[PDB]
């Protein structure tokens, strides 16, 4: 119906700095810094204090107002990644052929290498993304673990791994093989 004014609030926690100019956002915390380009949405940021920043959309209708909320979360998720940080856990799932999974690299690329998927003589490679680090659980069989400051980059690297193992020409209800996201959260305040 067009809304005269509607806004959102971003809690800037103790230890992080968020600065905004031309709808370009930089968030700096103890884990580091993240940048994001929000020129593709018309929102005007306003700062109340170093702990709280308000986002608003003057005179906007439904679908415009809808973007407002997601800007909050977007920026929110940046703040937490740079403090609490993000970690995605995955699990190897196979009924016969054990999925052998290693890290390899060319020209300092860093890839996630996957061998023997369903017996496959083929060799899958997921490029590791800048900022995400691949570990392997030591107390949990067939896990693998991806951690970083950016959910965006971490969740996507997680999906890329999981998607390279999609099983073709079989009943995928019966052939459940793959690498799937087993848990997603942080690297701080418990696991």
């Amino acid at each position: 119906m067009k809304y005269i004014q509607t806004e959102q609030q971003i809690e800037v926690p103790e230890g992080v700095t968020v600065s905004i100019k031309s709808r370009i956002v930089k968030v700096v915390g103890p884990r580091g810094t993240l940048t994001k380009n929000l020129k593709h949405i018309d929102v005007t940021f306003t700062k109340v204090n170093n702990q709280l920043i308000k986002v608003a959309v003057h005179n906007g209708g439904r679908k415009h107002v809808a973007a407002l909320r997601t800007v909050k979360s977007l920026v929110d998720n940046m703040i937490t990644g740079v403090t609490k940080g993000y970690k995605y856990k995955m699990r190897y799932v196979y009924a016969h052929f054990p999925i052998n999974v290693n890290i390899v690299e060319k020209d300092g690329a860093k890839f996630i290498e996957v061998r023997n998927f369903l017996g496959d003589k083929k060799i899958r490679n997921v490029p590791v993304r800048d900022g995400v680090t691949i570990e392997f659980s030591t107390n949990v069989k067939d896990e693998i673990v991806l951690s970083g400051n950016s959910v965006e980059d971490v969740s996507q690297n997680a999906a890329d791994l999981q998607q390279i193992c999609r099983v073709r020409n079989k009943d995928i209800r019966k052939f459940l093989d793959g690498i799937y996201v087993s848990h997603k959260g942080f690297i701080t305040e418990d696991l």
Partner: protein
């Protein structure tokens, strides 16, 4: 159907020797001019009572000028209108400074939102909502808040001349 004026229109059946002094009936009528106002009067009289202008007359036509023309008021409007598939009743609110103004944007709004032309619409009642919080539609309560203020982002001055030796700004 233009720049609207409100009319007091009053008529009666023509006197008969059986019924001298037949009763007077009045309507409030929004129309562009008296010649439409009178005609709208008969339009309704035909439908309500059972009368034809051939047997009745027009006692008086008087323009109802808005009482407080520069005082912002909230208007409740009631409407009956026909659609491509049915005929429906509606309640709407309009914020303005005069009944005549209220009607104008009502007639525009019916057309934009429901494609309803003038012919397809009866106005049932138009009533200045006295006590705020008897206002019932969000797009008007929105303007009822205290110390209310808003900007007008992205301002586009119209250029008087075709070429401009400077890149424009929308900065208001």
């Amino acid at each position: 159907m233009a720049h609207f004026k409100e009319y007091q229109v009053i008529g009666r059946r023509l006197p008969t020797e059986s019924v001298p002094e037949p009763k007077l009936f009045r309507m409030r009528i929004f129309a562009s001019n008296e010649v439409i106002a009178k005609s709208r009067y008969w339009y309704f009289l035909q439908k309500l009572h059972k009368v034809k202008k051939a047997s009745g007359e027009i006692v008086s036509i008087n323009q109802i000028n808005e009482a407080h023309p520069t005082k912002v008021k909230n208007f409740g409007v009631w409407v009956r209108y026909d659609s491509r598939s049915g005929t429906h009743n509606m309640y709407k609110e309009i914020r303005d400074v005069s009944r005549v103004a209220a009607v104008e944007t009502l007639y525009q709004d019916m057309a934009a939102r429901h494609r309803a032309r003038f012919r397809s619409i009866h106005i049932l009642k138009v009533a200045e909502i006295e006590k705020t919080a008897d206002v019932k539609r969000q797009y008007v309560k929105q303007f009822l808040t205290k110390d209310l203020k808003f900007p007008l982002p992205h301002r586009v001055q119209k250029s008087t001349k075709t070429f401009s030796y400077k890149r424009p700004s929308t900065f208001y």
